[PDB]
Scaffold this active site. Structure first.
Site, PDB file in Angstrom:
ATOM      1  CB  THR A   1      -9.041  -3.959  13.568  1.00  0.00           C
ATOM      2  OG1 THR A   1      -9.544  -2.950  12.685  1.00  0.00           O
ATOM      3  CG2 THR A   1      -7.821  -4.609  12.947  1.00  0.00           C
TER       4      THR A   1
ATOM      5  CB  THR B   1       0.642  -5.953   3.677  1.00  0.00           C
ATOM      6  OG1 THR B   1      -0.053  -5.539   4.860  1.00  0.00           O
ATOM      7  CG2 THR B   1      -0.038  -5.353   2.460  1.00  0.00           C
TER       8      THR B   1
ATOM      9  CD  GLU C   1      -3.162   0.577   2.203  1.00  0.00           C
ATOM     10  OE1 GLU C   1      -2.881  -0.265   3.082  1.00  0.00           O
ATOM     11  OE2 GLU C   1      -4.170   1.311   2.262  1.00  0.00           O
TER      12      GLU C   1
ATOM     13  CD  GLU D   1      26.181 -13.689  24.876  1.00  0.00           C
ATOM     14  OE1 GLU D   1      25.875 -12.612  25.426  1.00  0.00           O
ATOM     15  OE2 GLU D   1      27.121 -14.411  25.270  1.00  0.00           O
TER      16      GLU D   1
ATOM     17  CG  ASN E   1      -2.697  -4.197  18.620  1.00  0.00           C
ATOM     18  OD1 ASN E   1      -1.473  -4.165  18.716  1.00  0.00           O
ATOM     19  ND2 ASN E   1      -3.333  -3.948  17.482  1.00  0.00           N
TER      20      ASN E   1
HETATM   21  N1  GTP Z   1       0.372  -2.734  17.726  1.00  0.00           N
HETATM   22  C1  GTP Z   1       0.012  -2.143  16.594  1.00  0.00           C
HETATM   23  N2  GTP Z   1      -0.693  -2.852  15.647  1.00  0.00           N
HETATM   24  C2  GTP Z   1      -1.070  -2.258  14.493  1.00  0.00           C
HETATM   25  C3  GTP Z   1      -0.747  -0.936  14.250  1.00  0.00           C
HETATM   26  N3  GTP Z   1      -1.236  -0.604  13.038  1.00  0.00           N
HETATM   27  C4  GTP Z   1      -1.852  -1.684  12.512  1.00  0.00           C
HETATM   28  N4  GTP Z   1      -1.767  -2.714  13.407  1.00  0.00           N
HETATM   29  C5  GTP Z   1      -2.281  -4.082  13.224  1.00  0.00           C
HETATM   30  O1  GTP Z   1      -1.928  -4.505  11.922  1.00  0.00           O
HETATM   31  C6  GTP Z   1      -2.954  -5.281  11.342  1.00  0.00           C
HETATM   32  C7  GTP Z   1      -3.024  -5.039   9.837  1.00  0.00           C
HETATM   33  O2  GTP Z   1      -1.808  -4.506   9.368  1.00  0.00           O
HETATM   34  P1  GTP Z   1      -1.454  -4.508   7.798  1.00  0.00           P
HETATM   35  O3  GTP Z   1      -1.549  -5.894   7.220  1.00  0.00           O
HETATM   36  O4  GTP Z   1      -0.068  -3.955   7.611  1.00  0.00           O
HETATM   37  O5  GTP Z   1      -2.508  -3.516   7.095  1.00  0.00           O
HETATM   38  P2  GTP Z   1      -2.235  -2.998   5.592  1.00  0.00           P
HETATM   39  O6  GTP Z   1      -0.985  -2.164   5.479  1.00  0.00           O
HETATM   40  O7  GTP Z   1      -3.439  -2.253   5.073  1.00  0.00           O
HETATM   41  O8  GTP Z   1      -2.070  -4.376   4.788  1.00  0.00           O
HETATM   42  P3  GTP Z   1      -3.330  -5.356   4.629  1.00  0.00           P
HETATM   43  O9  GTP Z   1      -4.349  -5.011   5.683  1.00  0.00           O
HETATM   44  O10 GTP Z   1      -2.879  -6.780   4.797  1.00  0.00           O
HETATM   45  O11 GTP Z   1      -3.937  -5.185   3.261  1.00  0.00           O
HETATM   46  C8  GTP Z   1      -4.231  -4.876  12.052  1.00  0.00           C
HETATM   47  O12 GTP Z   1      -4.967  -6.026  12.392  1.00  0.00           O
HETATM   48  C9  GTP Z   1      -3.793  -4.160  13.312  1.00  0.00           C
HETATM   49  O13 GTP Z   1      -4.176  -4.913  14.435  1.00  0.00           O
HETATM   50  C10 GTP Z   1      -0.038  -0.217  15.198  1.00  0.00           C
HETATM   51  O14 GTP Z   1       0.251   0.957  14.991  1.00  0.00           O
HETATM   52  N5  GTP Z   1       0.341  -0.824  16.373  1.00  0.00           N
END
Ligand code: GTP
Ligand code: GDP
Ligand code: GDP
Lengths: 430, 431, 44, 101, 431
Positions: free
Chosen positions: A171, A137, A63, A246, A198
């Site tokens: 989410t 992703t 993305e 280690e 989270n």
């Molecule tokens: N701890 C934490 N989790 C995050 C954060 N941002 C996103 N996530 C988690 O990341 C997950 C999805 O991330 P990504 O796969 O990278 O979302 P994307 O970039 O749109 O890629 P896709 O959703 O796979 O198409 C979600 O289920 C969130 O729970 C963050 O800032 N902190």
């Protein structure tokens, strides 16, 4: 000489990388322009003839939005533009989309840049892969990248700071699906996988930082502090230095068992700071508290196998020894019968730097406890029924099939997660 | 850089699309003459999703206007933003479809579909990367329903992988405008089931109910209903156009919303819709947004969710808000209303957050619900279609256009099977 | 407010640029984020 | 092009002109298994009396016997270039009778 | 942080609630526009118990205003504090109940009760923690009694553990306003016995007595009676809103007041109510407050406590006062009037002390007495109900609304059983 290559895959990977790299810049004095007004930065930054420092990091995502946010924000003159790799189409929460169709060219370019980065490193302690299990992703492309790295680089230690879905809160809807797929993938490639949840970090922020509205920036700042504490022994000298190599020797008893709970202490706002003594014993106790765990997994259910403690700041070996002796004498903390020591204490003379704009207080002491314990099987147990409940109806399965996957892949992933459950039960049992 | 091809069909579709383009241009600071006057970098950052740059500073919508009568699109050019569209994207016939799906799909829609596809291909190729197409129209009309479904079929043939999104104004339950609405709706549903990847169901009577109960308007014209629909259609794609703390594109929404390919009809709503008198009397908080969002009155679909079960539900929030707060709100909603949510899906909510709220509103939230409640709407349309088809009233008009009688029964069979699948997943039990 | 038997901006020598960008400062943005995070406990 | 219930089961095997033979669960309505071995329209299917094997004919004369649980092609045989039409397993036997053009 | 949901029902209930909200806003320093203008920190410290914050500094009551005729709340909105209330919380029908409890409970109340429950649930879910509900209404009126009892039953079903407080204006003993007062009161008391956790009984003639004999007013309108009722309603919950030397919430009062679940009807009074002439002359002391509160004339209930026996009695004092002085005064009251106090309870007094007196008053004290004196009130209402019910006068109006005659008999039986319990605990002997 102690270079570590950082990979940030997906939105969560990049957003925790933002916090991590801001923290590293603050710690090493590097201004966001790229240069700072020795050689302790070499682990994370490579210096050029002009004196300007570029991080040895790679921001990988299918993305464009998240990467363009970095390209437009303050850290636009810091990072390498080609190291920021942006896709055209998102994976749309589809592991198949991120692993079979869209991820191919992106991972090829990623391996190209990773070769270019590793060619500039005399030594190479390992890779720090920061992704999000639960998204196309992060899960799919990250799994493909880890497989390629295992094939080509070989024995380089890959530490995967993965974020699994929380027990109840989430989410996404196909999150159990792609989480099971990616867990199947990374059971056999990453060397030490660090679990993050989270919900657990939200609870930590709400209870300790008194933040009634915790957000992703706060979560990423906590994760960044934890990774900085983990890498502190590579960059700053101190008594009882601990290494990336280690970690595996003192934390991984057997190759399949390498998933780790992580807990930072203290987590206190400045208003609550300097209101308690914050001694070594107290911070050790806080680090061993179940609420301080960044995974919704009660360690009381399981038994500790190993615990690596990373102390930062004004910490003395006498105090770490007294605290660890108290922990051993403690009854609620339970260790496996076959690991009498079960402790890897390492101290560092560099106190944790405080990020301006953060909620963490300036504390002279810190502990990062990374533990291998059999309780971690509980989260896999939760996902194993969250998966099969949807898999019984084959809901959302057409989405994954459309990008060139098979029902056999889902079956194999479920079977391997069941095998991992059985292995955790067996290591826990006498 | 993920482009969207907007297509408007029929009188209702054209009016809704014009209002939508007015709203989007207002959001991006685009005047009716095309020049940018927003004074904000983020407005121009992702303007290419909807607009293309002309020779000068002009920004033109990626919109294609379809109709068989020129009066509606003459009104389109007379509208407030009638000048942004390229004159070449106005594709018009000469004899309008007499509310006849057969006329708009076979006889008169056949000739103009050449120009429609030529313009669609011209606009799609110029796009760097194409997320897909969004077609706004009304079920229950000749040119809109028929010609639009024909276009949707052709575009599905040409670009199977690209996303297809439809905003269909299904005929209302109580007060029906035209007599042949059940026929046209029955014929169009059969096409949308097979072709449209993602479909939103809208009802003029539901829009009247929401604008009379929540907005407390006294004389809402069609402009206000188009305004609400335009708000929803902007909010669905704000994640592409703006940075988000947890972004989610159209394909992600469809993946998290659609369990099975035929269950892709969704009922949508927008928050916060506040009456003018109580604007000072509403406190803009995430719990208040969720409370209004999950209310059945806020749904722009006639069917109320309380009768059925939520298979899935996506919520795209906009504004400065806590991811913890949003996630806890949706989890708490699921726990409180576990009866109305499907059991064999552990989490029935796809939450997304965008950092750009709409102009003037500090926070907002658009809701897209895939629930079995739409079963009762399709059932009512069947109850009308069967009643008319038993005596074959008005059937001769469709027959004289070269449509076989078996096609009506095939469409009815498909729509009844869709009802059956909705009931099956409403009463499906885990294990 | 007790009886008392000049502007705050004039005091401390705050510049017009600071007055204009008071809420636009990144530090002030972080402060607002923290205040919003601590809902109803912000004034504690 | 053809349809046959798995013997004494709720599974239904249907062969289509899309060169695919798909086995479904009638109650659930989902495709349990799919076979893509054929290179032309699959005219017919037949089951072993026990359900062990499935013989699917092809328009080009190829008859493919698949195993139910192994979900793999046990025996791909070719008749003449003429279509194989429909087939039949022998009653508790190791013989398959196929039509032909 | 223990919120209370206020509900007003009927003409009398709505006007009492308006006066009560005027009093509470004055106490908290809230102007009619909702902005805080009080200049005292304790006022805003616990303002959330009754008010919620709007987008601005506006503070709006957590009040829900119920009626079947619109003119009453048109007057409410026209009142001095008419625009503080959330406009969405005004739930009114079109045709009022013609003083018909059947109309207000079964026919016309059925449709509007869904909207009422929606508003109540929306107000409750926004609360952090909910102490309970307080419903102000008048027995002996159609919409008031009917809708109040129906809503109380619904709220009891939805939130059984949450506290329920009622301020019921029982029809006056001597001078009745409407003919069907006995019918409405009899049907409402039966519901209140089963559903209402805590009930205050008020009489227009008792208030008229207090305003001629203590207050010495000349031509006091209903505003004055509503003002006194508002004083009691504020003073009962001032411990939640202000720090107290010995604080006591509504649940504590109910626990210390109710010996057995059905004996939850209480008479209340306020001190110090004095005339203008003797204001300079009267001594503002704890003994004077006790002497006034324990007077029968101070009661806002028609029944005089001398005939009955005090089962329990709570006194909530307000002002910087000596706890020893209070406790000694009330112990002395018990010892002096031991004939009026129940023997099998060693201490019949619950003392609560709050540190903030009401505005203008150096001191105050509100009294809530559970005594068997109310037995004679219920007996009189039964004497009227039986007199009409023997000849079935006006019974056809209720019967035409679809309630059985059997309901009247059941209500009378329940009310008589309550009277019998009151007599039993009046003449119960220890050991
Ligand atoms: N701890 C934490 N989790 C995050 C954060 N941002 C996103 N996530 C988690 O990341 C997950 C999805 O991330 P990504 O796969 O990278 O979302 P994307 O970039 O749109 O890629 P896709 O959703 O796979 O198409 C979600 O289920 C969130 O729970 C963050 O800032 N902190
Ligand atoms: N929301 C909305 N609905 C409309 C508008 N104009 C017409 N409709 C409705 O759309 C339905 C179908 O009419 P339409 O499809 O435009 O006729 P067609 O253009 O000949 O196909 C009618 O029943 C109208 O009630 C409008 O501006 N807004
Ligand atoms: N204290 C007081 N009593 C009232 C007021 N208005 C009406 N009442 C009395 O309350 C009784 C019941 O009237 P009510 O229930 O409000 O009529 P309804 O609203 O149409 O059902 C009447 O007999 C009146 O005597 C008021 O403003 N204050």
């Amino acid at each position: 000489m102690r270079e570590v290559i950082s990979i940030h895959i997906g939105q969560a990977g990049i957003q925790v990388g933002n916090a991590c790299w801001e923290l590293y810049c603050l710690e090493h004095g590097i201004q966001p322009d790229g240069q700072m007004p020795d050689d302790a930065f070499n682990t994370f930054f490579s210096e050029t003839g002009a004196g300007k420092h570029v991080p040895r990091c790679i921001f990988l995502d299918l993305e464009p939005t998240v990467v363009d946010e970095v390209r437009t924000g303050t850290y636009r003159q810091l990072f390498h533009p080609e190291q920021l790799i942006s896709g055209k189409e998102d994976a749309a929460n589809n592991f198949a989309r991120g692993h079979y169709t869209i991820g191919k060219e992106i991972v090829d370019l990623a391996l190209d840049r990773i070769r270019k980065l590793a060619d500039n490193c005399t030594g190479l302690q390992g890779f720090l892969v920061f992704n999000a299990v639960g998204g196309g992703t992060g899960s799919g492309l990250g799994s493909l990248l880890l497989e390629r790295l295992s094939v080509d680089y070989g024995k380089k230690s890959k530490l995967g700071f993965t974020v699994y879905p929380s027990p109840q809160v989430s989410t996404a809807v196909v999150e159990p699906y792609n989480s099971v797929l990616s867990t199947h993938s990374l059971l056999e490639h990453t060397d030490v996988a660090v679990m993050l949840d989270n919900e657990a970090i939200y609870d930590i922020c709400r209870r300790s930082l008194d933040i009634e509205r915790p957000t992703y920036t706060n979560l990423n700042r906590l994760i960044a502090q934890v990774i900085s504490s983990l890498t502190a022994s590579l960059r700053f000298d101190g008594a009882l230095n601990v290494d990336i190599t280690e970690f595996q020797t003192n934390l991984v008893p057997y190759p399949r068992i390498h998933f780790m709970l992580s807990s930072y202490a203290p987590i206190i706002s400045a208003e609550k700071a300097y209101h308690e003594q914050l001694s070594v014993a107290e911070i050790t106790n806080a680090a061993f508290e179940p609420a301080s765990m960044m995974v919704k997994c009660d360690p009381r259910h399981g038994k500790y196998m190993a615990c690596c403690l990373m102390y930062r700041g004004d910490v003395v070996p006498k105090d770490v020894n007294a605290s660890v002796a108290t922990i051993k004498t403690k009854r609620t903390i339970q260790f496996v019968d076959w690991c009498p020591t079960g402790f890897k204490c390492g101290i560092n003379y560099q106190p944790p730097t405080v990020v301006p704009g953060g909620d963490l207080a300036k504390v002279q002491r810190a502990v990062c406890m990374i533990s291998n314990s059999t309780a971690i099987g509980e989260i896999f147990s939760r996902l194993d029924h969250k998966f099969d409940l949807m898999y019984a109806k084959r809901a959302f399965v057409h989405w994954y099939v459309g990008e060139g996957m098979e029902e056999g892949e889902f079956s194999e992933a479920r079977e391997d997660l069941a095998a991992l459950e059985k292995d955790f039960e067996e290591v826990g049992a006498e | 850089m993920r482009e969207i091809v907007h297509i408007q069909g029929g009188q209702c579709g054209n009016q809704i699309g014009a209002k939508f383009w007015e709203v989007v241009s207002d959001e991006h600071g685009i005047d009716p003459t095309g020049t940018y006057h927003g004074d904000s970098d983020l407005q121009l950052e992702r303007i290419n999703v909807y607009f293309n740059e002309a020779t000068g500073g002009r920004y033109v919508p990626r919109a294609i206007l379809m109709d068989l009568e020129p009066g509606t699109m003459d009104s389109v050019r007379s509208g407030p933003y009638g000048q942004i569209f390229r004159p070449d994207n106005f594709v018009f016939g000469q004899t309008g479809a007499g509310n006849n799906w057969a006329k708009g799909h076979y006889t008169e829609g056949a000739e103009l579909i050449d120009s429609v596809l030529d313009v669609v291909r011209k606009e799609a190729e110029s796009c760097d990367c194409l997320q897909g197409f969004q077609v706004c129209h009304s079920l229950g009309g000749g040119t809109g329903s028929g010609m639009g479904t024909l276009l949707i079929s052709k575009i599905r043939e040409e670009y199977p992988d690209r996303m297809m999104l439809t905003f269909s104004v299904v005929p209302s339950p109580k007060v029906s405008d035209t007599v042949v609405e059940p026929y046209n709706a029955t014929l169009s549903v059969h096409q949308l089931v097979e072709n449209a990847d993602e479909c939103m169901v809208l009802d003029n009577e539901a829009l009247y109910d929401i604008c009379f109960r929540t907005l407390k308007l006294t004389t809402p014209t069609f402009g206000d209903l188009n305004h609400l629909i335009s708000a929803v259609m902007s909010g669905i794609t704000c994640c592409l156009r703006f940075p988000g703390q947890l972004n989610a594109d159209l394909r992600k929404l469809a993946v998290n919303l659609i369990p099975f390919p035929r269950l892709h009809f969704f009922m949508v709503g927008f928050t916060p819709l506040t009456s003018r008198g109580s604007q000072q009397y509403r406190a803009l908080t995430v719990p208040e947004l969720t409370q209004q969002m999950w209310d059945a009155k806020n749904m722009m679909c006639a069917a109320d969710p309380r009768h059925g079960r939520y298979l899935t539900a996506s919520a795209l929030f906009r504004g400065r808000m806590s991811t913890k707060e949003v996630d806890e709100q949706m989890l708490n909603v699921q726990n409180k209303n576990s009866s109305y949510f499907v059991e064999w899906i552990p989490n029935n909510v796809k939450s997304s957050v965008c950092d750009i709220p709409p102009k003037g509103l500090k926070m907002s939230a658009t809701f897209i619900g895939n629930s079995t409640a739409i079963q009762e709407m399709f059932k009512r349309v069947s109850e009308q279609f069967t009643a008319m088809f038993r005596r074959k009233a008005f059937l001769h008009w469709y027959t004289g256009e070269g449509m076989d009688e078996m096609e009506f029964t095939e469409a009815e069979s498909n729509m009844n099977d869709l009802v059956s699948e909705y009931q099956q997943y409403q009463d499906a039990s885990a294990e | 407010q007790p009886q008392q038997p000049v502007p705050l901006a004039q005091s401390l020598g705050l510049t017009q640029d600071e007055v204009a960008g008071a809420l636009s400062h990144p530090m002030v943005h972080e402060l607002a984020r923290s205040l919003y995070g601590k809902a109803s406990g912000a004034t504690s | 092009n053809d349809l046959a219930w798995q013997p004494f089961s709720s599974s239904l095997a249907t062969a289509s002109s899309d060169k695919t033979v798909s086995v479904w669960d009638a109650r659930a309505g989902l495709c349990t298994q799919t076979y893509y071995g054929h290179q032309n329209s699959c005219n017919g299917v037949s089951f072993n009396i026990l359900g062990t094997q499935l013989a699917s004919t092809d328009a080009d004369g190829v008859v493919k016997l698949w195993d139910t649980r192994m979900t793999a092609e046990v025996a791909t045989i070719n008749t003449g270039k003429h279509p194989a039409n429909k087939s039949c397993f022998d009653r508790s036997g190791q013989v398959l009778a196929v039509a032909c053009d």
